[PDB]
């Protein structure tokens, strides 16, 4: 009977509703706004986690680490543009050497 | 000659692109971005859009020229413009 | 006493890679990411409501904010998921 | 394609570059600059019409452009 289950989500619709109400965003919060927002957040984390799991699998590992998150983000142009001004701790850099270097 | 042209342009403030061509360009971009519903444009909306575009382009040219000088040239190249966009970094250069 | 989206991120991870785990630091990064995106979208929706002299943040502001913040292909599927969820929710 | 992007003429682009202080301009700079201006306008116009149709309007207002620029990180002042 939870709103998350009723909407088919794994993210907490009630918690998002409370955060919207308590965050000084507007006086009132519609009923579908937390549902929409939770769905969007769940979709975004699903995308990131899928790419990161693939990056970890390609490294022959079964645990995602900040390095894998960084590899997943900086290799998808959409996510790379979304998280443009974001620094990931312990993420390193992409293995990119200029072409004039390698002889 | 170019020197007096630069000195004359850098003390003026009027827009350098022609309003009607700019308006046509903006409108055709808008109709490419539409979802089957056409829009109108306040005269001030197009002036605002053109004031921002020209300022953006002028600043971009200033940056690109610094790159030209760094390379030892006095002639601005497309690679100097492309690199200035890359250093500005995906939101300021775009 | 300190609420975290760790359990939900872990559920989504189990859905998408049923046999992969996630480190604690990576989970903290995922929590930072969710909070950051939530704040972005909510702030934009607030600004929209204030621009239109409205006092309510509805699912229409969330959709428009998603369209403004997310790059194109991301935003398409994001609004797909959002409208799908609100339909499934109002259908009950 | 025939026009509307060629409306941004070489003398106009040259005036922009001279105000920027460019002393000497190559010939491929014109096509480069038309492309840059196009991609700049596409980003701002998209957001402007997004605002404009979130409000249930059909006219792109100056404030819609101002909000689009402000959200993209460029604040414009003469149109409040």
């Amino acid at each position: 009977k939870s709103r998350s289950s009723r909407a088919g989500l794994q993210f907490p619709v009630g918690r998002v509703h409370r955060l919207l109400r308590k965050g000084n965003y507007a006086e009132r919060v519609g009923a579908g706004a937390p549902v929409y927002l939770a769905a969007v957040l769940e979709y975004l984390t699903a995308e990131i986690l899928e790419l990161a799991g693939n990056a970890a699998r390609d490294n022959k590992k079964t645990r995602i680490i900040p390095r894998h998150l960084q590899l997943a983000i900086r290799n998808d142009e959409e996510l790379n543009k979304l998280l443009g001004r974001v620094t990931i701790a312990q993420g390193g850099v992409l293995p990119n050497i200029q072409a004039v270097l390698l002889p | 000659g170019w020197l007096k042209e630069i000195r004359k342009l850098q003390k003026s403030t009027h827009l350098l692109i022609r309003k009607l061509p700019f308006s046509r360009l903006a409108r055709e971009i808008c109709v490419k971005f539409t979802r089957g519903v056409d829009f109108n444009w306040q005269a001030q909306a197009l002036l605002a859009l053109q004031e921002a575009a020209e300022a953006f382009l002028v600043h971009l040219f200033e940056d690109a020229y610094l790159l030209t000088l760094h390379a030892g040239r006095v002639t601005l190249f497309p690679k100097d413009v492309q690199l200035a966009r890359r250093i500005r970094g995906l939101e300021e250069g775009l | 006493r300190k609420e975290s989206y760790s359990v939900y991120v872990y559920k989504v991870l189990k859905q998408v890679h049923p046999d992969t785990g996630i480190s604690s630091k990576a989970m903290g990064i995922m929590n930072s990411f969710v909070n950051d995106i939530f704040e972005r979208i909510a702030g934009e929706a607030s600004r929209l409501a204030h621009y239109n002299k409205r006092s309510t943040i509805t699912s229409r502001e969330i959709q428009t904010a998603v369209r403004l913040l997310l790059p194109g292909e991301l935003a398409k599927h994001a609004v797909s998921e959002g409208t799908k969820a609100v339909t499934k929710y109002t259908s009950s | 394609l025939r026009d509307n992007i060629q409306g941004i003429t070489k003398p106009a682009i040259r005036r922009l570059a001279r105000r920027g202080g460019v002393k000497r301009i190559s010939g491929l700079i014109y096509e480069e600059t038309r492309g840059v201006l196009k991609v700049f306008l596409e980003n701002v116009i998209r957001d402007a019409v997004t605002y404009t149709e979130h409000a249930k309007r059909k006219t792109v207002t100056a404030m819609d452009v101002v909000y689009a620029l402000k959200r993209q990180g460029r604040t414009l002042y003469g149109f409040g």
């Binding site: 899928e50 790419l51 998808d76 543009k81 | - | - | 096509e31």
Partner: peptide
């Protein structure tokens, strides 16, 4: 190329500073 669960092709950020034609 590379497609996710949704039909979202996640292209890699090749190059954007260069104008197209």
């Amino acid at each position: 190329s590379t497609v996710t669960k949704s039909r979202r092709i996640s292209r890699r950020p090749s190059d954007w500073w260069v104008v197209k034609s």
